[PDB]
Amino acid sequence: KFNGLTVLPPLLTDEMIAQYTSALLAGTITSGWTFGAGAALQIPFAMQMAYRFNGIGVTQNVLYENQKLIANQFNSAIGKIQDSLSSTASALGKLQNV
Amino acid sequence: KFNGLTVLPPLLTDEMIAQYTSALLAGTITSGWTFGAGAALQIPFAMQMAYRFNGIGVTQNVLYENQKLIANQFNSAIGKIQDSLSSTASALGKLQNV
Amino acid sequence: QSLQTYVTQQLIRAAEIRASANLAATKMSECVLGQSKRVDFCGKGYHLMSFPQSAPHGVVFLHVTYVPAQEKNFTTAPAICHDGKAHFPREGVFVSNGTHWFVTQRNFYEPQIITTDNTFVSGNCDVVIGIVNNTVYDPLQPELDSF
Amino acid sequence: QSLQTYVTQQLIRAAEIRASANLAATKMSECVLGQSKRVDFCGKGYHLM
Amino acid sequence: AYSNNSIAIPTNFTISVTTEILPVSMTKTSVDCTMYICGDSTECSNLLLQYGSFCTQLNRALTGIAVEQDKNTQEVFAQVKQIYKTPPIKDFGGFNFSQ
Amino acid sequence: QYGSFCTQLNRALTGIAVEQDKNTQEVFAQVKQIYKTPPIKDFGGFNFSQ
Amino acid sequence: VAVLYQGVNCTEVPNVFQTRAGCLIGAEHVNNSYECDIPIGAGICASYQTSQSIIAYTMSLGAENSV
Ligand SMILES: *[C@@H]1O[C@H](CO)[C@@H](O[C@@H]2O[C@H](CO)[C@@H](O)[C@H](O)[C@H]2NC(C)=O)[C@H](O)[C@H]1NC(C)=O
Ligand SMILES: *[C@@H]1O[C@H](CO)[C@@H](O[C@@H]2O[C@H](CO)[C@@H](O)[C@H](O)[C@H]2NC(C)=O)[C@H](O)[C@H]1NC(C)=O
Ligand SMILES: *[C@@H]1O[C@H](CO)[C@@H](O[C@@H]2O[C@H](CO)[C@@H](O)[C@H](O)[C@H]2NC(C)=O)[C@H](O)[C@H]1NC(C)=O
Ligand SMILES: *[C@@H]1O[C@H](CO)[C@@H](O)[C@H](O)[C@H]1NC(C)=O
Ligand SMILES: *[C@@H]1O[C@H](CO)[C@@H](O)[C@H](O)[C@H]1NC(C)=O
Ligand SMILES: *[C@@H]1O[C@H](CO)[C@@H](O)[C@H](O)[C@H]1NC(C)=O
Ligand SMILES: *[C@@H]1O[C@H](CO)[C@@H](O)[C@H](O)[C@H]1NC(C)=O
Ligand SMILES: *[C@@H]1O[C@H](CO)[C@@H](O)[C@H](O)[C@H]1NC(C)=O
Ligand SMILES: *[C@@H]1O[C@H](CO)[C@@H](O)[C@H](O)[C@H]1NC(C)=O
């Protein structure tokens, strides 16, 4: 910093970025994607999962009849991702190279 | 221009560009979209409106039963877009910047 | 030195504008000669069409976008059990104004009477959650009894 | 000479990272606010969210 | 207002028009060395000759840029095989297009 | 005596900085307003507490 | 071959054909339309054709038809 170099702080601080990310997550989880086009509608999660399955070529009967099981895996997957980053440091490589 | 700098005129003049844009608009308004694949076909505009509503999850009964009313909005839409460029000069920013 | 610096700057700027040219070409190919389902590509919302227009060293589009309006909320249920077996909507959402049940499409209010024409069964109503009790009208019995 | 070289290098890297910014914007607009059917774009396989 | 049983559905829609402006091409330019660096004098051209081959590189780069701009403005627009023309009569179901 | 070089350098660096600000503004702020999750969490057995 | 002098009038150069991009010698201007081979500029470009000579003309925007 002494000689001639200066650094300017970013316009958006970290907490505002976290607020945007939280808002996006909340919209995705409790509105589907109606807020992506116009006003934010509201719809429970179960039939949102049902339509997302319907969007790849499987009928709704796959989801509800196995709904409970579909929960467990989705939890366990997250229960793995933490261990995928709690110790391994090579995953966050690109940002380091930046 | 005096010292050493010269400018070369573009290969396609403005009239030719206007002719291409007019041709594209004429194809879109009547032929629908078949001319984008092969030979140009013909189809009434209302039928094309129905076939475009049929692609976003609404049935044809939405369009025809309100057809006249729909036209008004479209006209009014254009009735605004002139004013949005009639006085405001901040819309054309990128071209001026270049 | 000055001339080399000018040439380098021009090279970088032209290489930058090449990307905008490619993006405009892709938008012209997709938005105009067809309908593109990519969200927030051709207009902000559900896309209908586009009209191209020239401009000095540039192009200006006219995206025509479909956008919903004022809405009303109601009570839902993911399935209806009639004769022990489940009944799922073929394409739509179950909705009710508190007294009579209906099935409607997902982007415009249009109630319809429950009928086997737009319903298919899958198993009995003991595993699905949120199941409700109702009846399903049969369109073939009335002309069975018309004789 | 040294300062000009440094400025040129910074210019090139910024022009490179603009592409990653655009790609991230496209992925945010497509994968998140809807479902994208482009194979091997949002996840390896059939995409959900 | 979120709950495990509540669904909202719109009852009306509005058609809107949105614009976006994209650049396509720069201005094709060119600069000649001997007229610029030198004052149209042999006393300067002779000295510049000692420096080897730079101006060939510069002119090649500028010509490449110009050709790329021409290719860009050709590629963005000319995507249709033949030119069409609108019919003289206008009947588009009430839709107004004469702007 | 060397003329106008530092104007070019400062202009280039300022352009880069403004471009970075525009990039980080464009990547994230695509929502018109900030939403908030309800205090109660009933997502059909799904867990989002991480 | 044909020679193009860019942006200068053929009134003071030393079958000419003045054009917008400049003025050229060694070619004759026909009235017909053909697909462009060697682009010159301003919508005017030349080719080699039938005896045989270099001819310059206005570009043709492909074929034309109605719907
Ligand atoms: C849907 O909205 C449109 C306008 O957004 C409504 O049309 C209006 O109807 C009233 C009463 O007839 C008129 O006074 C207005 O001039 C109309 N507006 C326009 C732009 O034409 C329409 O009635 C609404 N439909 C429903 C079912 O609510
Ligand atoms: C589209 O709207 C324009 C604007 O109203 C119409 O142009 C008007 O036409 C009437 C009668 O033809 C004239 O009295 C007005 O002076 C015109 N307004 C102008 C020129 O600004 C046009 O006729 C409409 N086109 C269609 C097909 O309905
Ligand atoms: C999601 O899973 C986490 C991890 O098990 C749950 O957090 C645990 O909650 C129990 C009961 O409240 C506590 O006894 C544990 O100590 C918590 N674990 C940790 C690491 O804090 C969380 O409750 C789950 N979310 C739900 C059930 O909605
Ligand atoms: C419908 O939404 C409004 C707010 O938009 C809310 O006040 C009302 O309680 C909702 N109705 C039901 C039945 O949930
Ligand atoms: C619900 O809609 C049905 C449809 O005919 C109607 O008969 C009934 O009165 C409505 N109930 C209420 C509370 O609006
Ligand atoms: C929705 O949540 C309420 C809150 O206790 C509960 O009583 C009700 O059974 C739930 N509905 C379903 C279908 O799980
Ligand atoms: C639905 O009806 C069946 C038979 O009439 C009954 O066994 C069941 O408890 C009912 N369920 C509800 C939620 O009313
Ligand atoms: C070329 O010379 C003619 C001779 O009168 C003149 O009319 C014309 O304007 C000139 N064109 C240019 C571009 O100088
Ligand atoms: C056709 O070409 C001849 C030969 O130069 C020319 O004299 C004549 O004016 C041209 N006709 C048209 C309509 O351009």
Swiss-Prot record, chain E:
Glycan-linked positions: N4, N12, N96
Q: Which domain of life is it from?
A: Viruses
Q: Which cysteines are joined by disulfide bonds?
A: C33-C55, C38-C44
Question: What happens when you mutate D91Y?
Answer: In strain: 19B/501Y, Omicron/BA.1, Omicron/BA.2, Omicron/BA.2.12.1, Omicron/BA.2.75, Omicron/BA.4, Omicron/BA.5, Omicron/BQ.1.1, Omicron/XBB.1.5, Omicron/EG.5.1
Q: What is this protein's function per UniProt?
A: Precursor of the fusion protein processed in the biosynthesis of the S protein and the formation of virus particle. Mediates fusion of the virion and cellular membranes by functioning as a class I viral fusion protein. Contains two viral fusion peptides that are unmasked after cleavage. The S2/S2' cleavage occurs during virus entry at the cell membrane by host TMPRSS2 or during endocytosis by host CSTL.
- Tell me the protein's name: Spike protein S2
Q: Say which species the protein is native to.
A: Severe acute respiratory syndrome coronavirus 2 (2019-nCoV)
Which classification does the entry list for the species?
A: Viruses, Riboviria, Orthornavirae, Pisuviricota, Pisoniviricetes
Q: Which residues of the full protein are shown?
A: 706 to 804 of 1273
UniProtKB/Swiss-Prot annotation, chain F:
Identify the domain of life: Viruses
**Glycosylation sites recorded in the entry for this protein:** N47
Q: What does this protein do?
A: Precursor of the fusion protein processed in the biosynthesis of the S protein and the formation of virus particle. Mediates fusion of the virion and cellular membranes by functioning as a class I viral fusion protein. Contains two viral fusion peptides that are unmasked after cleavage. The S2/S2' cleavage occurs during virus entry at the cell membrane by host TMPRSS2 or during endocytosis by host CSTL.
Provide the protein name.
Answer: Spike protein S2
UniProt organism field: Severe acute respiratory syndrome coronavirus 2
